[PDB]
Amino acid sequence: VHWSAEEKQLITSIWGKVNVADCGAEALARLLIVYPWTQRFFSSFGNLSSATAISGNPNVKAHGKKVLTSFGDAVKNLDNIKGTFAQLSELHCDKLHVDPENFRLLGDILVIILAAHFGKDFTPECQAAWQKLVRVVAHALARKYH
Amino acid sequence: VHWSAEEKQLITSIWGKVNVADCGAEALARLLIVYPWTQRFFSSFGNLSSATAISGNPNVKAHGKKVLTSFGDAVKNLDNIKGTFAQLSELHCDKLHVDPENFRLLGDILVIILAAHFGKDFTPECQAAWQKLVRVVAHALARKYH
Amino acid sequence: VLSANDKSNVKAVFAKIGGQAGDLGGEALERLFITYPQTKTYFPHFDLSHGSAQIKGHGKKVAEALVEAANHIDDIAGALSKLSDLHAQKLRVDPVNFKLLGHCFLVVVAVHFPSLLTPEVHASLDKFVLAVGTVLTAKYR
Amino acid sequence: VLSANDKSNVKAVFAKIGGQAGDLGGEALERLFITYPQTKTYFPHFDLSHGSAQIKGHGKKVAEALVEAANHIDDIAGALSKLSDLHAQKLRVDPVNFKLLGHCFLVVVAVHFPSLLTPEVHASLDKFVLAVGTVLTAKYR
Ligand code: HEM
Ligand code: HEM
Ligand code: HEM
Ligand code: HEM
């Protein structure tokens, strides 16, 4: 992966300004609502039995914040994403057995969440840069395979 | 990617008995017939008008042999698959714009072709090693992407 | 098949923003081409320059098909009959690309109508765009 | 949709397999767990050791269901409706795993009946196992 000055600016600016708590909670809730098989991995989180329940679930909300904070670790060193996600890759692959397609789905959800948060400031170029970022992150998490 | 002695032996022993012309003809015909959108990439190959025409097409046969010979280059140096396929990645990604999912589908087809040819010698462990090989090749071919 | 609830969510969405759907289609397509540049190779006969009237014209048509599908949501296959043979038989569009365009449509909806796109509505719209993509690629399966 | 020729091909395959179906189901499942180890996560209540009687017994159930789908190939959704509820609502099986198992079934057919699995019959059987997977994931749509 190569990052242009323009891509770095688009990524860093959105990160600085994003509400990490609210957008992280939103991304996780939407993953669980839109793609409900993902609920299987979160059975310790309690009530996931409705969209309302998922969105109000304090464990979902707190975990969502952790997740977007972790995407923040990608932002902070864009040329070291592989290393940043090595330990998380062991977790998600070897321990939790999450198929990598779900990393793609969460990336797509995050893009939609950012689009909602930023409106027209989330230009097509901004979208391009962020979809590139979530794809790089997903690639780094799906390593302990191939 | 790490390859055990056992995995290496399952791969090379099968490969030593592969007829690349026959297996390659089978694999490419099956790609074009089973996943017909792939025909888009092979417009210059002539008659792809029916399943029968595709199996009888000499250009499909010839190209199939080249594809299998290439898989042979992976078998010959399992630890250097990334390097071996770097140039082919330029061709497939930057010039042909083949979505990587199609590399997975061709891999699955190759596994079925080997199963058909080798029958009871294509044990579950042999299948696991070959599926691993085709995934590692696919990831090498997709290198030019994320 | 889409549930009664999903159908109502789709109709609620297009009944509100159907007037803008044409413009939204143009933007969705612009975003497809910029976010996933490989998709431009399906359009070598278009002017794919940013701003281009052909992109805008064509996105308008994509959105109008979605609106037709919404208006006849109980038989989307029927509604989009010609279009299906077009995409799978004639054009041989790789099925992966339908999820990319459907996602771009959701992105445009989020950009312009954030309070409309609740998680429930997002779920229903995702199912809808996938149902359309499935109809258009039906000959593959 | 499955064409008439696809249906002929599928029924021919299952007629050939005949009473071996149960055993081939066990083999498909054994291959699933060995080739795609992540799938073992769904069976923590099973003995999953090599040779496991529980794997073989379960494979027979899977093959019984495929046989019924072949016998009712004109309406797979109808025949397997409650199986879909089980897999999607109760078990929350990731949709990707249906493609993996379907593939394992084709591999088993290839091992045992290579002359039957021509490219055309391969295409028909692929469409079949994908149609079954699509039915079983229905409650995700
Ligand atoms: C692709 C981007 C993803 C990122 C950046 C991410 C990030 C994280 C982080 C930072 C943790 C905390 C690790 C710890 O406490 O040791 C975590 C845990 C976890 N993740 Fe992810 N994740 C991603 C995708 C997914 C997906 C797609 C799923 C399931 C569909 C998933 C399921 C889980 C589960 C079940 C946990 C453990 C939760 C717990 O019990 O505390 N993750 N993830
Ligand atoms: C994943 C394993 C694959 C391997 C090992 C492979 C191998 C090759 C090789 C060795 C060549 C010839 C390069 C040359 O002659 O200089 C080639 C060309 C080509 N490949 Fe692949 N390929 C793979 C997958 C695919 C797939 C999945 C598609 C499309 C769905 C595809 C489409 C093509 C096309 C269109 C050409 C050019 C043929 C021509 O000369 O017109 N390849 N490939
Ligand atoms: C649900 C998603 C989609 C919808 C509703 C849709 C809709 C349409 C419509 C209404 C047309 C009619 C143009 C005409 O009649 O001249 C068309 C044509 C076309 N579509 Fe799509 N489409 C979709 C997805 C895609 C995708 C994913 C691609 C490829 C990336 C694609 C590529 C094309 C091309 C190349 C044409 C011919 C354009 C022309 O020559 O004017 N479509 N589509
Ligand atoms: C071809 C697609 C499949 C078919 C036809 C099928 C069929 C079946 C049948 C017939 C049963 C239980 C019989 C009964 O209770 O009456 C079952 C249960 C089950 N299936 Fe599947 N299945 C398929 C795919 C999958 C996949 C891909 C997975 C996960 C990787 C899976 C996981 C399970 C689990 C965990 C059970 C419960 C088993 C138990 O508690 O003993 N199934 N399936």
Side-chain angles (χ1 to χ4, degrees):
Chain A
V1 56
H2 170 80
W3 300 100
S4 73
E6 295 62 42
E7 285 171 322
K8 287 182 210 162
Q9 192 276 317
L10 291 169
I11 286 162
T12 305
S13 63
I14 291 288
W15 171 256
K17 284 173 170 176
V18 75
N19 191 316
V20 171
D22 288 355
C23 292
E26 186 88 54
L28 184 60
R30 288 172 186 262
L31 180 74
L32 297 169
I33 293 169
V34 178
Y35 305 115
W37 62 89
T38 64
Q39 294 173 23
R40 180 172 174 273
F41 298 100
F42 291 101
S43 63
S44 308
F45 278 23
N47 193 358
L48 309 174
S49 67
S50 77
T52 295
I54 291 166
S55 288
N57 181 302
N59 301 308
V60 169
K61 302 199 64 88
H63 190 70
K65 189 186 177 154
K66 297 175 160 189
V67 173
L68 191 46
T69 298
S70 181
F71 278 104
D73 297 323
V75 174
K76 285 160 200 178
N77 201 336
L78 291 165
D79 299 307
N80 186 38
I81 292 168
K82 173 185 162 168
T84 298
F85 292 92
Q87 297 191 312
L88 286 165
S89 171
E90 285 192 23
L91 175 64
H92 285 85
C93 300
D94 293 348
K95 308 298 201 177
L96 306 177
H97 298 107
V98 177
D99 188 274
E101 178 65 14
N102 299 298
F103 308 154
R104 178 271 185 89
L105 298 174
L106 181 58
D108 281 352
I109 289 161
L110 180 59
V111 172
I112 289 160
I113 288 284
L114 293 171
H117 197 69
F118 285 97
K120 293 175 192 126
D121 286 343
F122 198 74
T123 60
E125 298 76 8
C126 192
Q127 181 186 353
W130 275 91
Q131 181 64 224
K132 190 177 164 174
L133 182 58
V134 305
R135 287 196 175 253
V136 179
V137 176
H139 192 70
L141 283 169
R143 276 210 107 253
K144 207 227 254 358
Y145 322 108
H146 305 300
Chain B
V1 189
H2 169 78
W3 293 104
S4 67
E6 313 92 78
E7 285 169 319
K8 296 175 180 194
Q9 149 67 33
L10 293 161
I11 293 169
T12 58
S13 61
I14 290 282
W15 191 255
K17 300 178 89 82
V18 169
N19 193 291
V20 176
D22 302 333
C23 284
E26 280 287 336
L28 187 61
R30 289 168 193 262
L31 182 73
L32 297 161
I33 293 163
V34 179
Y35 304 115
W37 64 88
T38 65
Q39 295 173 23
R40 189 169 167 271
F41 296 102
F42 297 95
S43 53
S44 68
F45 278 37
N47 189 356
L48 305 175
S49 68
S50 68
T52 306
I54 287 163
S55 297
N57 185 302
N59 303 309
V60 170
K61 286 165 174 154
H63 188 72
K65 190 186 170 185
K66 296 182 180 210
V67 177
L68 249 207
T69 298
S70 185
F71 274 104
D73 296 329
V75 168
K76 280 184 71 205
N77 196 161
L78 293 168
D79 290 306
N80 188 39
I81 291 167
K82 182 179 167 293
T84 298
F85 290 91
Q87 282 171 10
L88 288 163
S89 179
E90 278 299 319
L91 174 62
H92 288 82
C93 293
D94 297 282
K95 293 185 183 85
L96 269 9
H97 304 104
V98 177
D99 187 278
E101 180 62 21
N102 305 114
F103 306 156
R104 173 266 184 97
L105 298 176
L106 182 57
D108 285 350
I109 287 166
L110 178 60
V111 168
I112 288 159
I113 292 152
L114 298 171
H117 181 74
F118 288 96
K120 267 143 273 89
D121 287 326
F122 201 68
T123 65
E125 22 292 303
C126 193
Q127 182 188 347
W130 275 98
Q131 183 64 43
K132 185 170 164 175
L133 181 50
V134 303
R135 295 265 184 167
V136 172
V137 171
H139 261 69
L141 271 177
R143 81 182 278 82
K144 272 34 163 185
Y145 300 123
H146 313 275
Chain C
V1 199
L2 316 170
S3 73
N5 189 64
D6 292 319
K7 287 172 184 190
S8 51
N9 282 340
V10 176
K11 284 188 178 286
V13 167
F14 284 92
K16 187 173 299 190
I17 65 170
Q20 297 195 44
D23 271 11
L24 296 197
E27 189 184 333
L29 192 64
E30 278 150 24
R31 287 173 182 273
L32 182 75
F33 292 148
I34 288 163
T35 306
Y36 311 97
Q38 70 266 26
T39 59
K40 299 188 288 187
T41 67
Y42 283 95
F43 295 90
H45 57 305
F46 276 28
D47 169 19
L48 295 176
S49 73
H50 297 158
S52 116
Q54 284 183 348
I55 291 170
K56 288 213 47 225
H58 189 68
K60 188 167 167 169
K61 297 190 250 189
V62 173
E64 295 168 337
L66 297 177
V67 174
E68 186 81 0
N71 283 341
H72 305 271
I73 204 168
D74 298 314
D75 180 32
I76 295 156
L80 309 190
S81 63
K82 65 187 204 286
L83 282 180
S84 287
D85 303 330
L86 180 57
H87 283 85
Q89 291 294 172
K90 298 200 162 53
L91 303 173
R92 301 302 207 186
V93 179
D94 190 322
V96 297
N97 288 323
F98 292 83
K99 283 195 299 185
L100 303 182
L101 183 58
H103 168 78
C104 287
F105 268 100
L106 293 174
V107 168
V108 304
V109 179
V111 161
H112 298 282
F113 307 108
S115 63
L116 174 174
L117 194 70
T118 60
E120 180 204 350
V121 170
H122 176 169
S124 302
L125 286 178
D126 176 67
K127 291 182 185 61
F128 177 68
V129 297
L130 271 283
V132 170
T134 295
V135 159
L136 292 177
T137 57
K139 284 205 214 178
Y140 293 153
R141 299 153 325 252
Chain D
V1 307
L2 289 266
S3 73
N5 189 65
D6 286 328
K7 296 185 181 174
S8 326
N9 284 343
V10 174
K11 290 198 185 273
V13 173
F14 279 91
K16 194 109 327 134
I17 296 172
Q20 289 181 59
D23 279 350
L24 302 202
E27 183 178 0
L29 197 60
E30 280 146 35
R31 288 177 184 272
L32 184 77
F33 292 149
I34 293 164
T35 298
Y36 309 100
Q38 69 267 31
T39 63
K40 293 187 288 182
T41 197
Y42 291 95
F43 300 86
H45 57 303
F46 271 29
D47 158 33
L48 293 174
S49 71
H50 189 275
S52 157
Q54 228 167 341
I55 295 174
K56 282 163 204 284
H58 195 64
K60 296 175 185 198
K61 303 187 190 181
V62 176
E64 191 187 341
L66 288 179
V67 170
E68 297 279 355
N71 291 350
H72 303 257
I73 195 166
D74 306 342
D75 188 15
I76 298 176
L80 304 188
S81 176
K82 300 308 181 229
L83 200 54
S84 313
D85 296 347
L86 174 66
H87 285 82
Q89 296 177 327
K90 189 184 285 169
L91 301 167
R92 298 302 204 188
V93 179
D94 187 324
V96 297
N97 297 136
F98 295 89
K99 305 173 192 48
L100 301 182
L101 182 55
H103 176 253
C104 290
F105 192 69
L106 272 60
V107 170
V108 174
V109 175
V111 163
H112 295 281
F113 306 97
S115 71
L116 209 12
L117 196 71
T118 58
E120 282 211 19
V121 168
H122 181 166
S124 297
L125 269 196
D126 182 70
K127 289 194 195 149
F128 178 69
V129 297
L130 283 21
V132 170
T134 298
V135 159
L136 294 182
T137 49
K139 277 81 218 151
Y140 295 144
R141 311 171 310 254

